[PDB]
Each structure stands twice: as C-alpha cells, then as structure tokens.
Amino acid sequence: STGSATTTPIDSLDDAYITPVQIGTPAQTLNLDFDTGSSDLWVFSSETTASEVDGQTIYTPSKSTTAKLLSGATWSISYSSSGDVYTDTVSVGGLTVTGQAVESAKKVSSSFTEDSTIDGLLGLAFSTLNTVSPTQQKTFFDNAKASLDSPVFTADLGYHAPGTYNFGFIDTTAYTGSITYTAVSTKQGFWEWTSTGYAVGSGTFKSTSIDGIADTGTTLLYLPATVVSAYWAQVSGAKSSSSVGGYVFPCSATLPSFTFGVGSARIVIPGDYIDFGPISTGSSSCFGGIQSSAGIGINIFGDVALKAAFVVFNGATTPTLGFASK
Numbered sequence: 001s002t003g004s005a006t007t008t009p010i011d012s013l014d015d016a017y018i019t020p021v022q023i024g025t026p027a028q029t030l031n032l033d034f035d036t037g038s039s040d041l042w043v044f045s046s047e048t049t050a051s052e053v054d055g056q057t058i059y060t061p062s063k064s065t066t067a068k069l070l071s072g073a074t075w076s077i078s079y080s081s082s083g084d085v086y087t088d089t090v091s092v093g094g095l096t097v098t099g100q101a102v103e104s105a106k107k108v109s110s111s112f113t114e115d116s117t118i119d120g121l122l123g124l125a126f127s128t129l130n131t132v133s134p135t136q137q138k139t140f141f142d143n144a145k146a147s148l149d150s151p152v153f154t155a156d157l158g159y160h161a162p163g164t165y166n167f168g169f170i171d172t173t174a175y176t177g178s179i180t181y182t183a184v185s186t187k188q189g190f191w192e193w194t195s196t197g198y199a200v201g202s203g204t205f206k207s208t209s210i211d212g213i214a215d216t217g218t219t220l221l222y223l224p225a226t227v228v229s230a231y232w233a234q235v236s237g238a239k240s241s242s243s244v245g246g247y248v249f250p251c252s253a254t255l256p257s258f259t260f261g262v263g264s265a266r267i268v269i270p271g272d273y274i275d276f277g278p279i280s281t282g283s284s285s286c287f288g289g290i291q292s293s294a295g296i297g298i299n300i301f302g303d304v305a306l307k308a309a310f311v312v313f314n315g316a317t318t319p320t321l322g323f324a325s326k
Contacts (some may be wrong), residue, residue, distance in 0.1 A: 001147050002168035003095025007034065007157065010117045013276055014303060015219055017157060018117060019165060022091040023102060024064035030057050030119040034165055035217030036155075036191055036313065037300075039129040039139050040077055042103035043120035044112075047084060052108045055116030059104065061086050070101060070135075077131045080109045085132055090140060092122075095167050097144050101137035121217070124153070124313070128189040141167070141315060151315040155216055156326065157307035159273060175310035175324035180265040184319040190215075191313060193321050195301075196263060198223075200231050201256030210260075212299035214306065214313070214321055220276075221258075221269075222293040222300040231258060231290050238288070244279055247288035251278055258290065260305065262323040269308045 007017040018031040023043065030043055044056040061067040066089045073085040083106030090100040105120075112118065123130070127138045145151045148168035156174050157163045164174075185192040195210040210223065228247070232238040234256055238249035249255075255271035274289035289304045312322030 001095060002149055002166070003093045003144075004164065004166045005093030006162055007165055008162040009158070009160065010115070012160070014160065014307070016115075016118060017163070017216075017303070018119075019092070019122070021122060022089075023059055024061075024088055025066040026064075027091070028057075028059055028064070030059060031117065032120045032122045033118050033217060034122050034124060035215075036124045037213065037215035037217040038077070038079070038121060039123040039125045039127055039189065040075060040103055040131055041090070041101060041120075041122050041140060042075065042077070042081055042083075042105055044108070045083070045104040045106075048105045048108060052110075052113045054113050057119045059102065059120075061088065061102075061104065064088055066098075070132075073101075073132055073135055073137075075103045075131045075133070080107075081105050081112065082107045085137070092140070092165075092167065095144060095148075097140055097147075100140060100143055101132060103132070124216070125191065126186050126189045128186070144168075145315060153313050153315075155306060155311045155313070157216070157303060159307055163307070170312065175326045177325055179310070179312060179322040179324045180262045181312075181314070181320040181322045182263055184321055186319060191319070191321060196261030198227060198261065199259040199266075200234055205259070205261070205266075207261070210299055212301045214311065215300050215302055216306060218300045218302035219304065220300075220302050221290050221304040222296055222298075222302070223290065224299065225292050225294050228290055228292045231256075232288070240292075241285075244285075244287070246291045248279060248285045249288060251284060251286040253286075260301075265323065267305075267309050267323055267325065269305060273304055273308060 043059040046060040070085040076082040084104040190213040197207040199205045258269045276287040310324040
C-alpha cells in the first residue's frame with residue numbers, strides 16, 4: 001500500500017509546514033508538523049492543562065473506540081513537552097497503521113501554545129530517539145514499512161506554496177534529471193549525511209566535507225562559521241547582530257544563490273529563499289536564512305535547504321538519502 005498527503009506553510013515566511021492526520025475511530029483530524037529530526041508522535045490532548053491551549057484542535061481518546069491506554073508508559077522531550085501514552089489507529093493520506101503510540105500531552109512549553117496552527121508533531125527520524133519509557137516505541141514510518149510497497153517516503157516542500165509527503169513510492173514527474181543517493185549514518189539516530197562542498201553565488205566550488213542532518217522540522221540552514229562568514233561577506237551591509245541573535249542584512253539588498261554538493265551533483269538554493277523578511281514590523285533590517293551552527297553542535301540542513309529539492313528518505317536495510325532538482 002501507499003500514502004500521499006499535502007503539506008501547507010503555516011504563514012507567509014515558511015516557518016513550518018502542517019499536514020492533516022486522522023487519529024482514531026470515528027476519525028479526529030489534527031494538523032501535525034512532520035519532523036525528520038525527532039522520533040515522537042505527540043498531540044495536544046484533552047489532558048493538557050487548559051491554560052496551555054490557545055486555539056489548537058485537541059485529541060480526545062474518550063471519544064475513540066480503538067483507543068487503549070499504554071498502562072505505565074510515559075514520555076518527556078526537549079528540542080519541551082511531556083505526559084501519557086495511548087495506542088490508536090493513525091492514517092496519513094489513506095495509509096493506515098493500527099496500534100500506533102500516540103503521546104498525549106499533559107504539559108507543553110509556551111513556544112507551542114503561542115502557535116495556534118500546530119496541533120502536534122509526527123517524528124520521522126530513527127526509532128532509537130523515541131522518548132517513551134520504560135518501553136521504547138516505534139515511529140509511524142517504522143510501523144508502516146512492512147505494509148508499504150517500497151520502504152521510502154519523499155519530501156517535496158513548496159516555496160510560499162503547498163507541497164507533498166508521499167509514502168511507499170517515488171513520483172517520477174515531481175523532479176527533473178536523476179536522483180543522487182548518498183550514504184546515511186544512523187549512529188546518532190538522525191538522517192545524518194556528508195555534503196561534498198559549496199559555492200556562493202556564481203563563485204568557484206569549494207570542495208570540502210560538511211557533516212549534517214536532513215531535518216524537515218527545523219526552518220533554517222545551520223552551517224559552520226567559515227562557510228556562513230564567506231556567504232554574508234558578499235552581501236553589502238550584512239552583519240552578525242548580538243541583540244537579534246544572528247546575521248541580518250539591509251532589506252534593500254539582493255541575495256546571491258547558495259549551492260551544496262550531493263556526491264557529484266549540485267543543489268542550488270535561490271537567493272530569494274534566504275530572505276526571512278524584516279526583524280520587526282516596518283524595520284529596515286532583514287533576517288538571514290543561512291546562520292552559524294557554532295552554538296548547536298551539529299550542522300542542520302533545514303527547510304530553507306530541503307525545499308530547493310525533491311528529497312528521498314530511503315529506509316532500506318542500509319539507509320540512503322536521495323536529492324534531485326525540481
């Protein structure tokens with residue numbers, strides 16, 4: 001079997017993408033953030049303290065006939081949120097998984113409460129990072145793998161437009177040219193991989209190894225200080241501000257494109273994708289799309305980078321990552 005769902009940006013800047021998901025019988029449709037950077041399926045529930053809910057759709061397990069409490073199991077995660085665990089039927093664009101662990105939130109940080117559009121997260125990293133204790137639970141993709149035609153899923157995120165998440169197949173019309181596959185390392189539990197270099201604007205390709213993670217749940221591109229300093233050196237008037245917490249540039253400037261190497265191929269990010277609008281309403285300074293990873297511990301290839309390509313997350317015995325131009 002296969003699954004296909006549409007994903008839509010939450011706002012004008014592409015801060016996150018929400019996908020409708022059917023949890024329960026009769027179904028309750030929640031709008032979740034598909035995150036390849038984590039491994040938990042958690043939702044705003046009927047058990048969340050009422051003060052931390054501000055417009056979100058809530059999951060109510062008392063109203064579902066296929067819901068069962070996973071007695072004794074508990075979760076706690078930080079990127080924060082914690083609570084109870086139930087098992088129920090989850091379906092994504094027609095693809096149905098019975099017995100999925102659905103993590104019911106009891107506590108949620110104010111960063112989630114302020115985002116009324118996001119009803120929860122659907123973790124798509126490797127199951128080793130699942131926070132359910134004492135019995136670690138499997139992700140939606142790991143539970144569907146046996147029932148899928150092919151153990152894969154693709155990501156076709158749109159620039160100021162909706163996009164798609166397919167499961168069990170590859171759409172040969174969604175991209176141009178061919179797909180370039182690279183080796184994944186599952187040691188840290190992420191879709192970890194090595195880029196073969198970069199180029200700023202119409203410049204020369206600097207061949208160098210950049211180890212990072214492909215993360216749909218992170219908005220921006222976080223690369224090393226040397227690479228980020230080389231980029232912003234080409235934008236007149238750009239500068240790393242302490243007060244803002246990163247690079248900013250005069251909104252009147254035109255950004256050059258950025259290229260990242262996948263094996264022998266090249267994936268181009270247009271300049272426009274790197275502009276995250278003004279810092280405050282009516283401001284003359286704009287926020288940068290390429291920021292330094294120095295204070296994180298890992299390079300993150302977020303939405304800014306991923307939405308310039310047709311990305312394949314091959315979950316075979318030996319996982320790989322595929323990138324193609326679109």
